[PDB]
């Protein structure tokens, strides 16, 4: 154990250890991996009763059994010796308490280096099983509904319940809060403001639509082409789907239908929707690079790159797709996944994001930047495909397709999707 910090959940360092040698090295990266990213090996132990976190830094992962016994005795001596300072609601009990735990830890560390030489989980057991069987039947991935349920027996273990609460309604509630915060990815988006920033180098805005076969990449690409034209934007559809029959005439019917609603006469006199196509059988990274150089020269604010649908287990073809998105450097990689897929929503995005970073040759690789959740009008409340997607990926559901026309494109109501999923 080279490191040990104990702070509260309100972000207040109570006590820290870094050895007599220098001091206080890496207490912030310790907090980040251990509390920030969970809602030298850097692990943690949570006291959820009194809102404490016990972050430790060690090597030789095989000594994890004695490092866990040292966090358990330090956690038992800390919450007993300072039970008065940590049990009060006021943050002025911890600001005014004196946590001189250095001589108690040096004794628990030197003594654990000789061994090397309320709400329990039994109560919350039955309701975490009825909630896991409700998420799975409401189309949350089978294992996403298992980690979700265990994030809640952890969060409420030790904690006292309200004046009017049961075992059932507590794990049922903190599972809704751990589900809205994970369906709240660490990302945001914008509009014309974002193409003014793409004009800081005088270049268009290139979005890449990727995904598995039949989800709605081409049809929702046309709902977003109608949504960009509605905001006054000219969009050049790059037809890089050269692995199918009628993949260019599908996009040419979308360009004929969109250059009818938004013609040059009703736009100022200039072309606003135009298809860039090179036929079938051509390279999809060569038609895409020609359409970015063509939209720059012909003045198209947006390029919407349509790619062919593929599986998730194709080493010679997820190589060519991951190399396309790595090299083309698109502004927003939009994974298109249907709201009808079940447990495959996890395997699609994990292999789609693992490919984009493997066959990438950068330091920080270009990963999927969002999700388009299509066929939303087909599940009717079996909505757990939105949770399975923003769970594994910490990327937002940029659009939610709700039909086949251009007007069936919605923003995500992520609050009522967890309220429908956590109500059983």
């Amino acid at each position: 154990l080279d490191f040990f910090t104990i702070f509260s959940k309100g972000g207040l360092v109570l006590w820290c250890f870094q050895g007599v040698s220098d001091s206080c090295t890496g207490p912030v990266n310790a907090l980040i991996r251990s509390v920030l990213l969970q809602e030298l090996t850097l692990k943690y132990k949570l006291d959820n009763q009194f809102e404490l976190v016990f972050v430790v830094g060690f090597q030789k992962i095989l000594t994890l059994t004695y490092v866990d016994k040292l966090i358990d005795d330090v956690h038992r001596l800390f919450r007993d010796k300072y039970r008065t300072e940590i049990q009060q609601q006021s943050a002025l009990s911890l600001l005014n308490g004196t946590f001189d735990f250095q001589n108690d830890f040096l004794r628990l560390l030197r003594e654990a280096e000789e061994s090397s030489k309320s709400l329990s989980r039994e109560d919350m057991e039955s309701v975490l099983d009825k909630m896991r069987d409700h998420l799975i039947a409401k189309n949350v991935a089978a294992d996403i509904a298992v980690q979700l349920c265990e994030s809640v027996a952890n969060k409420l273990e030790g904690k006292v319940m309200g004046t009017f609460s049961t075992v059932t309604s507590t794990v049922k509630q903190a599972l809704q809060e751990s589900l809205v915060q994970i369906l709240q990815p660490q990302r945001r988006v914008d509009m014309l403001r974002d193409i003014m920033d793409a004009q800081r180098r005088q270049r268009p805005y290139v979005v890449t639509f990727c995904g598995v076969n039949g989800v709605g990449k081409s049809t929702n690409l046309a709902k977003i082409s109608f949504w960009l034209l509605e905001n006054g934007f000219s969009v050049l559809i790059a037809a890089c789907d050269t692995f199918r029959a009628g993949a260019v005439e599908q996009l040419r019917t979308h360009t004929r239908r969109l250059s009818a609603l938004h013609p040059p006469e009703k736009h100022g006199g200039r072309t606003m929707v135009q298809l860039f196509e090179k036929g079938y059988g051509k390279d999809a990274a060569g038609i895409a690079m020609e359409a970015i150089a063509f939209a720059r020269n012909q003045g198209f604010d947006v390029v919407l790159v349509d790619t062919a649908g593929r599986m998730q287990d194709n080493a010679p073809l997820m190589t060519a797709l991951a190399k396309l998105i790595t090299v083309n450097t698109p502004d927003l990689v939009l994974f298109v996944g249907e709201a009808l897929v079940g447990n495959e929503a996890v395997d699609q995005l994990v292999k789609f994001n693992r490919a984009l970073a493997d066959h990438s040759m950068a330091q920080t690789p270009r990963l999927i930047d969002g999700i388009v959740l299509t066929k939303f009008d087909t599940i009717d409340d079996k909505v757990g495909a939105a949770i399975s997607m923003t769970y594994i990926t910490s990327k937002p559901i940029v659009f939610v397709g709700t039909g086949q026309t251009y007007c069936d494109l919605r923003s995500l109501n992520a609050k009522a999707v967890v309220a429908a999923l956590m109500k059983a």
Binding site: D2, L40, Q59, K60, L62, E113, D358
Partner: protein, 218 residues
């Protein structure tokens, strides 16, 4: 001439599994890497029904390409031992098989450091191979579970890799200083347990062609 061994291993692991912790996939990419380096360059060890020892001699080291063959033997036996460290948490006998792959990963890297001692290789790959040996000897004597023999070949690997940084440009020193910083966390743990007892080029000299000051001429 040159070989960036550290850049070779780091971008082959992040691309073939080790970003998500797949040592079984990284070793299989290492074995297919070596088979296809052997089938292309016609450097097969055995023929059908017989085996002959592969000896990478000094004459074939001009290619700047056969050092990657022995390195893919060092990275294959290293990747197998790290996978056997995850399977030894539930099968503690797997540790005996782990330590037999790490003694032959330093032996390939000690035979690959002796090959780089040739005069046909620059002053960059002799020393990337010298201290890739001293890094695998500090990880084997760290898995010996002796904390003292672990900081002896880690402070040796740190002092070698730092002697290589100071000798060249601070831009090429970045690779050798990235590897002293790469093995520096392991040195703080063994010191805690000893004392326990054509590119685009612009012709910017055409913008310098201008008139002399014509104030004295009026």
């Amino acid at each position: 001439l040159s070989l960036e061994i550290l850049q070779i291993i780091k971008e082959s692991q992040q691309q073939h599994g080790l970003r998500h912790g797949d040592f079984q996939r990284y070793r299989g990419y290492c074995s297919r890497r070596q088979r296809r380096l052997r089938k292309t360059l016609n450097f097969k060890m055995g023929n059908r029904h017989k085996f002959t020892g592969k000896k990478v001699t000094e004459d074939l080291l001009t290619d700047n390409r056969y050092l990657l063959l022995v390195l893919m033997d060092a990275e294959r036996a290293w990747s197998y031992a790290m996978q056997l460290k995850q399977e030894a948490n539930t099968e503690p006998r797997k540790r005996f098989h782990l330590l037999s792959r790490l003694r032959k990963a330093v032996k390939h890297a000690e035979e690959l450091e002796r090959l780089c001692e040739s005069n046909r290789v620059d002053a960059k790959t002799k020393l990337e191979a010298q201290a890739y040996t001293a890094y695998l000897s500090g990880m084997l004597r760290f898995e010996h579970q002796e904390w003292k023999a672990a900081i002896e070949a880690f402070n040796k690997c740190k002092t070698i890799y730092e002697k290589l940084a100071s000798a060249f440009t601070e831009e090429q020193a970045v690779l050798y200083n990235q590897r002293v910083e790469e093995i520096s966390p392991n040195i703080r743990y063994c010191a805690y347990n000893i004392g326990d007892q054509k590119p685009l080029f612009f012709d910017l000299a055409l913008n310098h062609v201008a008139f002399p000051p014509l104030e004295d001429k009026l």
